[PDB]
Motif scaffolding. Structure first.
Motif, PDB file in Angstrom:
ATOM      1  N   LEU A  53       0.649  -1.258  -0.031  1.00  0.00           N
ATOM      2  CA  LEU A  53       0.205   0.060   0.001  1.00  0.00           C
ATOM      3  C   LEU A  53       1.040   1.226   0.223  1.00  0.00           C
ATOM      4  N   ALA A  54       1.938   1.100   0.473  1.00  0.00           N
ATOM      5  CA  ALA A  54       2.947   2.309   0.587  1.00  0.00           C
ATOM      6  C   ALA A  54       3.112   2.886  -0.658  1.00  0.00           C
ATOM      7  N   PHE A  55       3.168   2.113  -1.819  1.00  0.00           N
ATOM      8  CA  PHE A  55       3.313   2.931  -3.154  1.00  0.00           C
ATOM      9  C   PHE A  55       2.139   3.259  -3.644  1.00  0.00           C
ATOM     10  N   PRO A  62      -1.730  12.162  -3.848  1.00  0.00           N
ATOM     11  CA  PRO A  62      -3.119  11.415  -3.698  1.00  0.00           C
ATOM     12  C   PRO A  62      -3.250  10.330  -4.850  1.00  0.00           C
ATOM     13  N   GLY A  63      -3.748   9.080  -4.420  1.00  0.00           N
ATOM     14  CA  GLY A  63      -4.401   8.054  -5.347  1.00  0.00           C
ATOM     15  C   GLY A  63      -3.041   7.589  -6.019  1.00  0.00           C
ATOM     16  N   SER A 116      -9.933   2.548   1.426  1.00  0.00           N
ATOM     17  CA  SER A 116     -10.309   1.951   0.391  1.00  0.00           C
ATOM     18  C   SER A 116      -9.165   1.096  -0.247  1.00  0.00           C
ATOM     19  N   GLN A 117      -7.950   1.867  -0.496  1.00  0.00           N
ATOM     20  CA  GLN A 117      -6.976   1.065  -0.844  1.00  0.00           C
ATOM     21  C   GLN A 117      -6.700  -0.056   0.182  1.00  0.00           C
ATOM     22  N   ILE A 118      -6.794   0.123   1.375  1.00  0.00           N
ATOM     23  CA  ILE A 118      -6.569  -0.966   2.151  1.00  0.00           C
ATOM     24  C   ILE A 118      -7.238  -2.073   1.664  1.00  0.00           C
ATOM     25  N   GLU A 119      -8.628  -2.087   1.277  1.00  0.00           N
ATOM     26  CA  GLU A 119      -9.323  -3.015   0.873  1.00  0.00           C
ATOM     27  C   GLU A 119      -8.957  -3.551  -0.255  1.00  0.00           C
ATOM     28  N   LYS A 120      -8.771  -2.872  -1.457  1.00  0.00           N
ATOM     29  CA  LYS A 120      -8.228  -3.335  -2.590  1.00  0.00           C
ATOM     30  C   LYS A 120      -7.034  -4.164  -2.424  1.00  0.00           C
ATOM     31  N   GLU A 121      -6.054  -3.699  -1.503  1.00  0.00           N
ATOM     32  CA  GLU A 121      -4.803  -4.383  -1.284  1.00  0.00           C
ATOM     33  C   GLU A 121      -5.270  -5.721  -0.705  1.00  0.00           C
ATOM     34  N   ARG A 122      -6.244  -5.821   0.191  1.00  0.00           N
ATOM     35  CA  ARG A 122      -6.689  -7.176   0.794  1.00  0.00           C
ATOM     36  C   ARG A 122      -6.851  -7.983  -0.131  1.00  0.00           C
ATOM     37  N   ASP A 123      -7.569  -7.878  -1.095  1.00  0.00           N
ATOM     38  CA  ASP A 123      -7.954  -8.790  -2.204  1.00  0.00           C
ATOM     39  C   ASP A 123      -6.518  -9.050  -2.798  1.00  0.00           C
ATOM     40  N   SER A 169      -6.326  -2.909  10.134  1.00  0.00           N
ATOM     41  CA  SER A 169      -6.892  -1.711  10.561  1.00  0.00           C
ATOM     42  C   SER A 169      -5.987  -0.585  10.232  1.00  0.00           C
ATOM     43  N   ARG A 170      -6.636   0.266   9.508  1.00  0.00           N
ATOM     44  CA  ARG A 170      -5.640   1.486   9.096  1.00  0.00           C
ATOM     45  C   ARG A 170      -4.820   1.964  10.338  1.00  0.00           C
ATOM     46  N   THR A 171      -5.356   1.623  11.672  1.00  0.00           N
ATOM     47  CA  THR A 171      -4.787   1.978  12.741  1.00  0.00           C
ATOM     48  C   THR A 171      -3.663   1.013  13.042  1.00  0.00           C
ATOM     49  N   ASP A 172      -3.875  -0.363  12.774  1.00  0.00           N
ATOM     50  CA  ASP A 172      -2.747  -1.285  13.170  1.00  0.00           C
ATOM     51  C   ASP A 172      -1.863  -0.767  11.997  1.00  0.00           C
ATOM     52  N   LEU A 173      -1.916  -0.778  10.903  1.00  0.00           N
ATOM     53  CA  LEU A 173      -0.995  -0.590  10.155  1.00  0.00           C
ATOM     54  C   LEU A 173      -0.280   0.875  10.235  1.00  0.00           C
ATOM     55  N   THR A 174      -1.276   1.829  10.926  1.00  0.00           N
ATOM     56  CA  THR A 174      -0.461   3.084  11.397  1.00  0.00           C
ATOM     57  C   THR A 174       0.497   2.923  12.472  1.00  0.00           C
ATOM     58  N   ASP A 175       0.228   1.972  13.323  1.00  0.00           N
ATOM     59  CA  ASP A 175       1.006   1.615  14.497  1.00  0.00           C
ATOM     60  C   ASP A 175       2.195   1.184  14.011  1.00  0.00           C
TER      61      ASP A 175
END
Ligand code: 3PE
Lengths: 412, 76
Positions: A53-55, A62-63, A116-123, A169-175
């Protein structure tokens, strides 16, 4: 006559190293001392999913803005994650050196994780994990890591269990981002047509203020792992070929006899049979990864074991000289290309704390003789409990008594 | 021989090195319970028959002696 690698250190703590050469295609790259070893089984895929997701999206860009910039100068953007290190590197031209550094700054800080991006990557990640099983040697090396480092954070995988990947979670990642992306654990490495003073300036402007303070002094710390001799035998008879890895405990990054062990690997039936010296911090796995039809794994194991003992007992000067020559051609250098030189710096500043020059490597190679090679091989291979990982038609793969016992020659 | 014995799939099998594990893990800890578990599972199918054997044995011996015993009315 090889130019020296010059290292500086910024207040933040991040080490902005560099190297210079006539080439004009520099590879700038940020290395971070953060991998699956620093994860605590509740965030086992945080580094991988942040890498994916970093990239894709940063606050300032943005995006897909970043990937456009990177297209505009024709640069190449790569990232990878291991059990101990994470790298974000760019291959570009020399004259595009500032903006690339600025781009890297966004990628390490000010990054934006779009839910959103998080979700796409999850896939993407889940599916690949769902198809990653296809790559056998990856399955076998993951099995070897799991059974060799049972109960430790070195058994887990860069990818992590499917569960952790689903639940992030965005938060977990954030951590993970805010915890394992500290400035003293970061190296800005540059190789090729770069000036060190210009890179040091660019470093401060774009890479300053990198976080350095942990939360509530939750300063991470690390565990010396245990090498649990054990085996894993994923039997699936429908596969056409079998992959078997056998390893023992390695010395680590800072132990110099690694060099001697590398010569031993340079000295060493069943299709592919590559030797390997995976060396994490404070431990590693010296060993072999041999693929083979189900009816020859047995013999191969014996051959492999035989070779090792030969290296523990009957090493001669000619094969030692051959192994030294083979090692001295694995030296990484400008002729190896920037990206390779780039990478070394980052790994050298993260692991050794300094860039070991090729002259010191040549000195440590030429001090190796046959007597100390068989001494170090007897220290690390003889009468040791191995970790065995098999996948495929592995019924004729011998069990643990035949392997371990085969590690000691009744004739010495 | 090995390699051509059977076809299994997806059966992972973990194990440990002998020197890495205790030689007699909980030997008397669970050994006793298990041995006791085991006996109660076959005791009813093993002992009963032999019990009757002890019985026939005894009855047989005693009966013989009685046969040898002199008949009181005999000779009187
Ligand atoms: C309190 C216990 C708590 C722990 C309980 C543990 C779990 C229960 C275990 C019970 C014992 C195992 C099950 C079992 O023994 O089944 C009953 C057994 C078979 O019964 P059945 O099939 O009728 O056999 C007739 C053969 N003509 O029939 C019998 O067991 C008795 C067989 C007697 C044979 C006697 C032969 C004498 C002549 C020589």
């Amino acid at each position: 006559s090889v130019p020296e690698t010059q290292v500086s250190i910024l207040d933040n703590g991040l080490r902005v190293a560099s190297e210079q050469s006539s080439h004009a295609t520099c590879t700038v790259g940020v290395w971070i001392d953060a991998g699956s070893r620093y994860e605590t089984e509740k965030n086992n895929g945080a580094g991988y999913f942040l890498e994916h997701l970093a990239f894709k999206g940063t606050k300032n860009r943005p995006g897909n803005a970043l990937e456009k910039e990177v297209e505009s100068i024709g640069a190449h953007l790569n990232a990878y994650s291991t059990r101990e290190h994470t790298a974000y590197l760019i291959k570009a031209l020399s004259k595009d050196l500032p903006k690339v550094v600025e781009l890297l700054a966004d990628i390490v800080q000010n990054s934006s994780l779009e839910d959103s991006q998080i979700e796409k990557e999850r896939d993407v990640i889940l599916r690949e994990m769902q198809e990653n099983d296809a790559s056998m040697q990856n399955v076998v090396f993951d099995y070897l890591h799991a059974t060799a480092f049972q109960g430790t954070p070195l058994a887990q995988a860069v990818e992590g269990p499917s569960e952790n990947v689903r639940r992030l979670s965005r938060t977990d990642l954030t951590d993970y981002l805010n915890r394992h992306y500290k400035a003293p654990r970061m190296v800005l490495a540059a190789a090729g047509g770069v000036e060190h003073q210009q890179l040091l300036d660019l470093a401060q402007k774009h890479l300053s203020s990198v976080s350095r303070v942990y939360e509530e002094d939750a300063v991470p710390g690390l565990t010396p792992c245990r090498f649990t001799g054990s085996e894993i035998r994923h039997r699936d008879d429908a596969l056409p070929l079998a992959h078997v890895a056998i390893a023992v405990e390695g010395p680590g990054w800072a132990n110099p006899d690694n060099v001697t062990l590398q010569v031993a690997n340079a000295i060493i039936l069943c299709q592919s049979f590559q030797t390997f010296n995976i060396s994490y911090s404070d431990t590693g796995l010296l060993g072999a990864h041999f693929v083979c039809d189900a009816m020859s794994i047995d013999d191969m194991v014996f051959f492999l074991q035989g070779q090792w003992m030969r290296l523990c007992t009957s090493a001669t000067e000619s094969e030692v000289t051959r192994g030294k020559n083979i090692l001295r051609n694995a030296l990484v250098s400008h002729l190896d290309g920037t990206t390779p030189v780039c990478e070394d710096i980052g790994r050298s500043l993260l692991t050794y704390g300094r860039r070991i020059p090729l002259a010191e490597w040549e000195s440590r190679i030429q001090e190796v003789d046959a007597q100390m090679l068989r001494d170090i091989c007897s220290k690390y291979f003889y009468d040791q409990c191995p970790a065995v990982a098999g996948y495929g038609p592995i019924e004729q793969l011998p069990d643990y008594n035949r392997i371990r016992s085969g590690m000691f020659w009744l004739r010495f | 021989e090995f390699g051509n014995l059977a076809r299994i799939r997806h059966v992972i099998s973990y194990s440990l090195s002998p020197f890495e594990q205790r030689a007699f893990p909980s030997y008397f800890s669970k050994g006793i319970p298990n041995v006791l578990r085991r006996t109660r599972e076959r005791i009813l199918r093993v002992a009963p028959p032999f019990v009757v054997v002890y019985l026939i044995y005894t009855w047989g011996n005693q009966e013989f002696e009685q046969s040898k015993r002199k008949n009181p009315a005999m000779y009187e």
